[PDB]
Symmetry: D2
Subunit: 452 residues, 4 copies
């Protein structure tokens, strides 16, 4: 990369944001003609979620939109990343539009526009309509067409006021956890060939959705990966190369959670070489035309980075340091992940990057003073943003940063046991309390990160 140098810091137009997802915050799961999604059904199965928690109510954001918009305004957030519930706007996944569903997102988007906040809309954040799951979901040859139909509804209803779209959030997780490990909806443990089939249908769906989102108003379109960057052993050229090679490695026995398996198709129009040689029973047939469809021009690469892994001089994984700083969900704190992830992604693809999710699970409580003190989240955010600022100085084009999350919410198979918010939610009363990290972040945004 060509360095920028450390004097400028974050660019003038930098998108300081916070992020949520529909199922994690909305509730109103069975209201106003909304159709079932796979998380409604999965979360109601005994033993799938921590303490059989579910998203039936979550943060009740469907009913408490105005309060949450006021928090976004109070904290001076420039951009709000949210997902649309596919099943709320298309209860059967295709066909009849639910105008009460559309009306909710119209009220949200109007509220953002009134407050001068830039919407960043994720189309797919894991809540596949249940009607489409019954038709085989992502195993079905027609699943890309279902997604294209949804993307056309999105562009039709929201294309006037929304100029930032992300097709998919973390295919690594919804495919790997949903269909390989089985710990996420719909909870399957499928053979390798079926994981590649699902991946290929998701990637074709992405291509068709990009084509739908290009019809009409100009917009910026991205694709968000879950990334666990390899942090080199030193600044030696050879140690950096070994980390880069490990970061972008994949093979038939370890691919679904990798970066290159998903981003090489999207950005380079090719799978890793090993995909061409797999003969497993029922492998999908991957065509030149498929790869042209998948690799539609997009405007930014989304990275959701929480931590990375330290690698030795040869790219082998080092064991975690004894007593390494960690988070309430168990993950280690590895500040250099928000340097190396963006740097390596920039070097491989030469595309602008948005950090579409970064944050920390903390054991947050309301203290005797009635406040929510989260100094560990402040330290995490401070350390990670210093590393991102260094990546910008070293020539990475970073266009935005979205704190995961605006609200404490439903953390998937961990239920409500993990709190990622800069806003505390008391689920008994639905009270929002802005945490110390919210006010810390407000100050970062006001100063454009100049004082980090």
């Amino acid at each position: 990369l060509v360095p920028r140098g450390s004097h400028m810091g974050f660019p003038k137009d930098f998108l300081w944001g916070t992020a949520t997802a529909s199922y994690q915050i909305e509730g109103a799961a069975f209201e106003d003609g909304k159709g079932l999604n796979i998380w409604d059904v999965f979360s109601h199965q005994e033993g799938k979620i921590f303490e059989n928690h579910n998203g039936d109510v979550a943060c009740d954001h469907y009913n408490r939109l105005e309060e949450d918009l006021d928090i976004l305004s109070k904290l001076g957030v420039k951009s709000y990343r949210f997902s649309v519930s596919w099943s709320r706007v298309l209860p059967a996944g295709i066909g009849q539009v639910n105008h009460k569903g559309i009306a909710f997102y119209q009220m949200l988007i109007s509220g953002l526009r009134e407050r001068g906040i830039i919407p960043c809309m994720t189309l797919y954040h894991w809540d596949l309509p249940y009607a489409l799951h019954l038709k085989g979901g992502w195993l079905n040859d027609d699943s890309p067409n279902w997604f294209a139909e949804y993307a056309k509804v999105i562009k039709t209803y929201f294309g006037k006021e929304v100029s930032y779209f992300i097709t998919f959030n973390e295919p690594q997780v919804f495919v790997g956890c949903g269909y390989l490990s089985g710990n996420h909806a719909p909870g399957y443990q499928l053979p390798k060939a079926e994981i590649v089939r699902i991946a290929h249908n998701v990637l074709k769906a992405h291509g068709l959705a990009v084509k739908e989102l290009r019809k009409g108003e100009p917009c910026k379109i991205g694709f968000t990966g879950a990334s666990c960057p390899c942090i080199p052993a030193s600044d030696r050229k050879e140690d950096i190369e070994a980390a880069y090679n490990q970061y972008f490695s994949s093979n038939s026995n370890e691919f679904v959670f990798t970066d290159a398996f998903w981003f090489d198709p999207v950005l380079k129009g090719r799978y890793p070489k090993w995909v061409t040689y797999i003969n497993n029973v029922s492998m999908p047939i991957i065509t030149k035309e498929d790869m042209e469809l998948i690799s539609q021009p997009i405007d930014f690469v989304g990275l959701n980075i929480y931590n990375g892994k330290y690698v030795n001089e040869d790219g082998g994984i080092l064991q975690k340091k004894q007593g390494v700083p960690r988070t309430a969900i168990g993950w280690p704190i590895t500040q250099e992940a928000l340097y190396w992830g963006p740097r390596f992604t920039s070097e491989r693809y030469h595309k602008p990057i948005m950090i579409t999710g970064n944050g920390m699970s903390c054991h947050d409580c309301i203290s005797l003073d009635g406040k929510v003190h989260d100094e560990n989240r402040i330290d995490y955010m401070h350390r990670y943003l210093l590393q991102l600022k260094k990546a910008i100085a070293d020539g990475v084009d970073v266009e935005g940063y979205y704190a995961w999350s605006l609200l404490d919410n439903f953390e998937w198979a961990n239920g409500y046991n993990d709190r990622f918010g800069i806003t505390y939610v008391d689920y008994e009363t639905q009270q929002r309390i802005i945490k110390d990290s919210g006010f810390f972040y407000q100050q970062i945004i006001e100063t454009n990160g100049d004082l980090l």
Copy 2:
């Protein structure tokens, strides 16, 4: 029941048969334009089958048809129960017929007719076309229509020469093991509501297939259950009633492996009462019109019985006797199952019964004399047939008995480790050796079971 008396013995036109299934014997899994089925894909998944056995070749019956037809003729079998590979005749499950697939079954059926052997054709013996699995399989609202299309192909191509059809073999097993326990293809562990959805689609599929099979030539149509009869503690009226009540019991926590859950819809046009009250997330909508479709008139009830369970005077399950006679697959030998299962099924439904499968897994070997001696299978068959003969004397209308199986074959998740044949197969050479039980059965058929 109203008795017949013991003098007739087996009826003069009794169908003395043997049974197989397509995936268990055919092989040629990837030949002659045959489409994949779910067992091709499941059996190739690491750890799903004993020693990673699969049906790729099985008994190579696709190539060795003439030899197997000659064994049927040599043993004087009156009827041959076999299944058609849906994926062999319709590689995508619907649309284009594969004429090489049809040609195989035409050669089989011509061979049977030449030898004076009555074909008994199972449409579905668990090998769902993989193309339909990718569309959600039995979760898809359209799965009954897919099956109807297949049944129409069957009637169109085979209706002139085949007059005995069975729509489904053992829905208890392919739904319970395939989608609840996950030990059979496709290997899922689904919620209760999805098991009911699948069951309802299988039952509607049955109804549409009966309508297709009625178009054109007259025929006899059946539906085959897996049954584990409750054997009463004594001949006391109250002990018999308790066994009957347990045998036909079901509830929302234990239904998929039961008799009444499947046969009450097929024969009485109603589900067990408990199904009316279930509100679980995503329950299918069960209509009056659905139940009329499911309960199309059929000609016989198929029972596959290997053993039963002894119940106390109150219908509670008794613990197995210490050192109870058992089989090579681990199941107990309970001769009275082939009395009580037919008797109770006759009392509930008043329909003719065919024993569509009865037999024993034995640790068979080629002895030093080059023969296969299976006295334990002879004793099993002799004991069970005496009990069936007593059921006929006591007024059960039994129209046939099919020995499971003609050949040692692929026993599903147990691979080739369980040998049920009256014919031994050496898988190294594909040599067939008729076992002592084959000659024992030949003599039973010649004497119409008069000397049992």
Copy 3:
């Protein structure tokens, strides 16, 4: 408020902090061997070095003095003082504890000595450990060594720490050393040998200098959902309940023998093959007079008359080890234990696992631990106001340390340890606690 002579303390255990596992003639213990078995500990962590407290005694004594702690609860490594568990005393082992106790006395800090905090000598494990009929005699021999060498300068002893955990996790669930899953009869045999060992150790500790002797339970108090008499009764009954399918982790299974000289009723009706024979003489031995009941309380569970044990609240405040924060546990545990047994209570362990780290300012900020301690101590203060005799409170722990099967992944300290350098950094909670002790909790 808190009594004038209230024992404000902090607590540790030998295996969790000492290190020096294989030197100065120390014998192996079951945790040395268990922690080296693949997959038994988080990331195969072990106590070989731990906080290296064996070698950093002076630094850690200075932290105790800096924070103004009135009492220090520690355990003696049985395998350090008796390498084979019985027979030859290791005088280098004795010398370490003599240096610690001299250091405490120099600083005006009251020693509180736990004899058994789970580090069974490996030599005794090879002889069947607590299954062996002679295991109470092994423990009595150890208690006699303790009284002989430390009886002059130590006046507070606890025989056993949390038999619920070392028996239940060690021999029923198998997640703690030695990692067994034994039948019910063997769990009762082990429990009965531990309880007889306790009785024999009390008799040894009574020989010579007068002292206060206790026995420490792991307790998860039942918190009545309200102050209604009915809810209180229901909570008390649940708290002291046990049955043959769920007893080893309960209060009454262990404390009824120690304090009342009887087992719960249900023990009478177990006839399983190999059940120990429990005699009148055994129960007299177990129920030696003791001076205080030790409670280690981290949290409780909410109970009502109508609901029984209530489901945990969605998003309940919790700790880094996953446990919920239930402030009223440090009211009701002491109160109900006081009402049942009429003995003084010592809180021998209370604290919180936090995801602590060194912030960019070089400090360790643990506001969640301060809030936890503030809330729990207000509840203990209310118990004292309502007439419960509480003699002391020991913060678990002085140091971040080896948290058993969780290895170093759980930090309970009021002092942070950087394991790379062994640097100690007193956390905000340490200074918070210093201020509580200086004011005797008057400003809570």
Copy 4:
């Protein structure tokens, strides 16, 4: 053919047939306790009654006489003769074995006495069992009782049956009593104590009357791909291989100590915490001269030209317990064992689990067991023809019995037992075997 003095036998074990588990002063053993733990045995079967052979001795002796068996291999219940494992002899226990041995002598049947067939006295288990440094001395005390009471009339002794199984299944996999999953160092400690126990027992059995002493391995012979010298060498090398990750179920790990006075080289270079110290003096003790090597062989494995284990053939002939039928195992196991150790071989156990039952004719037809026995004995006869010194063959088992964790679900007998009535029905295989013995196997 077979030598004129060839020991044609059948074999049983105390816990598998005796019953009378809790009477005539018999002490508990580890199988009495393990079998009563929920879920350890198929359908919670146990040996409390088994074949009731303790009470039906005369009937079973008459079956041995009817079938013309030359030798009867049985085990002594350690807990029946020494209820606490050491100390007071139980003379009612001794009296049972004296009645058995007198019965055999009256019928001209040669006793072959197994001292240890897995029923460790429970009292010794409570003292750590084979982990205890003194476990070799406990076994020596038992062996001295055996020689004292039975040395006049018994001239064939086997110290241990299948250490591979009672150590590997008992303490590594945990599927057999006492049901543990111990670290590698503890498995080696147990193995070393068993081997020292063997050495001390041989010394006790040599005091007084002359006798033949053996040690019985569980063996799964490697069958070469062909009679090519290189294929044979590859099979031999695989058969006698072992390493730290796969040793407890091997031949060389146990037999190299007993016969060569060496462990495999890898053993002495393990430095795991708590490894036993293995001395020159220990290896001299373990490697006392013995008279025969006992092999219990049910099947083997086929190896390729390079000694790699081939996958089982699809549809391989197998038994009711799931094991394959591999006739050449009873050629190559004896041949390779003979070549490595230059000792006479006794096949102390060979037989087949079959799904036997009483047919409508009231008989028990077991043609698969006849074919198994005929095939395996032809291979043993070929080993003898090729110069292997084989002194005897013992059919496992005289009776259908308690097959350990499989309970009564596996029938290995040449005699069927109806457990409802305890009726014995000699199977077709019993009459087949009678004819083999009458003709000394000349007509196989």
